[PDB]
Design an enzyme around this catalytic site. Sequence first.
Site, short mmCIF file in Angstrom:
data_model
loop_
_atom_site.label_atom_id
_atom_site.label_comp_id
_atom_site.label_asym_id
_atom_site.label_seq_id
_atom_site.Cartn_x
_atom_site.Cartn_y
_atom_site.Cartn_z
N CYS A 49 1.75 -14.57 54.35
CA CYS A 49 2.48 -13.30 54.51
C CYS A 49 2.68 -12.79 55.94
CB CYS A 49 1.80 -12.22 53.68
SG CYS A 49 1.53 -12.76 51.94
N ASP A 50 1.59 -12.60 56.67
CA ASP A 50 1.65 -12.11 58.06
C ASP A 50 1.82 -13.23 59.12
OD1 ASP A 50 -0.88 -13.13 57.47
OD2 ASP A 50 -1.83 -11.93 59.04
#
Lengths: 151, 268
Positions: free
Chosen positions: A120-121
């Site tokens: 995700c990040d």
Amino acid sequence: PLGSMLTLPEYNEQIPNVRSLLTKWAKVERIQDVQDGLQLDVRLKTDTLLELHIYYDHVYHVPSIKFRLWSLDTEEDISSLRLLTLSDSELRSILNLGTFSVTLSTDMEMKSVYYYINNCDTDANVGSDVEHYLTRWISLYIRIFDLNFVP
Amino acid sequence: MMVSDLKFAPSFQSFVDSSFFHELSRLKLDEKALYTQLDLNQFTSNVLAISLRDDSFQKPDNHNIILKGYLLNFNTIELFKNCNKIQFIKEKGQELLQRGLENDLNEIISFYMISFADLKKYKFYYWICMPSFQSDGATYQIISSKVIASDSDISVSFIKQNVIIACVISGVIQKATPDNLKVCEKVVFKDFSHLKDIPSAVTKNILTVWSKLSPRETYTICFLRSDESSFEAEIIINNGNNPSLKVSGWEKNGLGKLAPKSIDLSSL
């Protein structure tokens, strides 16, 4: 609204490099080119084979790593390779997760499993530049398996 | 150079994905032909890699080189553990010996998997072998060898084809058919080895056949390699006309020992 601009095409233009420098990594037993990725055979510990997959995630537009561990046990006179499912505590022992996180889930067709490094990040991690995106990525991420690997 | 012994490197190295023994069970609940696209542009440990995924059960061509092997599965660790491999490989050899004598040289190269799919503990035992036959007490020696170049049109010609074995009759390749194998200047081979001057055990098959068909003084073979190690050698088959066939061919498991290999799946 920031987000990865990395195109599957751009990701594939860069895979050969990841393959090249990933060869310098002395732990690598093998490296298959596969569709939209690379599949390495690595010797993480002297009895732990690391089946590592590098692919391109379409949701978040970043490169991802899914792997799974195998233990080199010997039955009698026969060599065995057994899938490991360790606790996140057990897992955190043989790796260098630090600020990262891995979730053990099932594969596309619920046949077996993979450890997934949450991606995700990934982008807020690697950086703005789409140029060398795959390099800066692998450089940093790979560290989860070997702090000493110099890319 | 001087008449030298001809050393052979093991033919292959197996890499059976776990996704294979699942596909097996899916099918076991509803002997089979295994297929695999040979990667010749990149070996591992200097030898061909026989890769066995889950889709190792279907042909995708009539473009790329597909090898056809055969897998037989046993019901108990008993029928598996108690079955002498030597006879199995031997017999498998003779079949191939025959197929080379009456058809083409390509038909000699093949692999065999004997597996015991134990669902009880979800463990899997297998053993692969790729037949290498020679007439008992036979020996080979290189008279001389030259460095082959692939930038040669002649090589570029073998490359373009979709076969691992072929002939040179006038400067143009051609199916290694028993007939074509009697006026052929030399044989060509997309070796399953990258060890400098050391061709794969599977070369013996080419020799044993090419000989028993068209007996000669020497036999020139050209080993082609994705590497820079391509070479042509003048071989000599000594002491071999014996009727009995000796066939080696099993791969050695990760312990170095000649045993099967286990792919334990207890977690799942």
